[PDB]
Amino acid sequence: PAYHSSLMDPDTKLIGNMALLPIRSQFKGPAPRETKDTDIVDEAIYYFKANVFFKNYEIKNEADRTLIYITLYISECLKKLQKCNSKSQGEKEMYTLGITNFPIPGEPGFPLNAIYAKPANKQEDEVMRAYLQQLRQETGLRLCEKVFDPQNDKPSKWWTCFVKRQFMNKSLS
């Protein structure tokens, strides 16, 4: 069946109903440090091309809810990357796609409000907005390297062919 996150550490904190997994990013936000070479965003991209076909998905732990979110977002990048004319322009719009206001667990979906938990309190809410933002900005950046070919700076059809396929028939747009 589908691919789950195998980075579930004994001492992993959680925001809402998601694991607050560290990332190796240059974008500022509420993510922990990471002196390794792998993380939840690498796991999401390595797994993306497979997971996106699956409709059903059992949630083994909190780390999977973070894996799901990034997987869904990866599809939102591809929709926007499809029209771009350069790897540089893809970065302009992946910055823009991070800044874009999206819905969180609780608001009109985010069409998965059944599975995710609401970020109660004033601290859990402001941190959830910012952690999802840091995931959106770092995922968008790494995808720009992966999607664009070395010639003519156009998106590769080997990433653009996935643009119409929806993970669990859900979508952030």
């Binding site: 691919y3 390595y46 091309k49 076909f53 699956f54 409709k55 059903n56 059809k157 080997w158 062919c161």
Partner: protein, 404 residues
Amino acid sequence: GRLPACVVDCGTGYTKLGYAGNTEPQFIIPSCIAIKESAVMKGVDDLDFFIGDEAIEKPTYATKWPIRHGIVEDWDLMERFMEQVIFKYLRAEPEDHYFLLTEPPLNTPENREYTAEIMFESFNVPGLYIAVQAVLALAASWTSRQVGERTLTGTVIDSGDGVTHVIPVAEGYVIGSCIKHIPIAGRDITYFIQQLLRDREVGIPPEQSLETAKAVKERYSYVCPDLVKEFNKYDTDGSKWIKQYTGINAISKKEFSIDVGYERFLGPEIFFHPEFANPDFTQPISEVVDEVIQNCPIDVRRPLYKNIVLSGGSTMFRDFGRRLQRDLKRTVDARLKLSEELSGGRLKPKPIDVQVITHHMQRYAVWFGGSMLASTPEFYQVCHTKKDYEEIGPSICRHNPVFG
């Protein structure tokens, strides 16, 4: 006597036909028939119909497919299809030849008997035998073990164009209570591969989109051990795995070419993850086979497990049987592992021996078995004669004494 019997396997997609004794049917034609559009018609327009390839694009004719999901829908058209099988292709004087016809497995009394009439009264055949695919595939597979054993007990995966069935068999007859079917078959894979091509490739002329999809499917796809590792090979290496096929545009006669890659392993994967192309079904084939076998009687499960025979065209992808045996000895011991972890005295019973066979005679399974049966002397002894058809009546074609 001294001219062998005719043998016809009629399937949803393809009819295989030829004479008994041979290793493979003389012809393999599409199971369609092209007729007129404006059907009260007089004259000799009934005699106006073409068959097979020469009718897959006939200008002024309507192509009709008289066989749906294994079973005959239209007997008038199946009646004419037979007329040309016998007189155009086989060129058998039908009065001089016994015939062997095949039937789906679950074809009821008011079905196989319907095809016996319109044969014994039109074509005047001296003898008829309506056989079953459950046992002919099993017989075709004995060309592998033989030194091992030769029994008619085993689980059969018949996968063709219409329907994929899982059919447990125990010493001759078919238990018709534990049969499960799967909504994944040849045409569904072709359709899903065609889909992937439209999403990605251009230059394929719309008319030849299926043609190309079939050729990609039939000519290249092969099951993989793990999905992500394969997509990884294709993104890491790429050139060493993406092959290139150039076809001819049928209208302009100039070439068109496309990249082949993601639809090599994904196409056959839908057997193991049907949800990929099927909303209403999710259960992988490995689980369906396990489930069928545990629904069967205790004392026949181990025999069924160790003789899982593959039949039909959609079982031909390379290393499809090796992946099938993994599934089963993933799941099956998993299950028994619990019988250890959930008990003490009863914890240990016997490692279930699972074996998927993979012989060279696969697409020619049912027909081959039928050709071998019709070659033997005892075939003429278990065949229903015309004399009996007339004197006893059409009831006799309802059954065939379980030989052995």
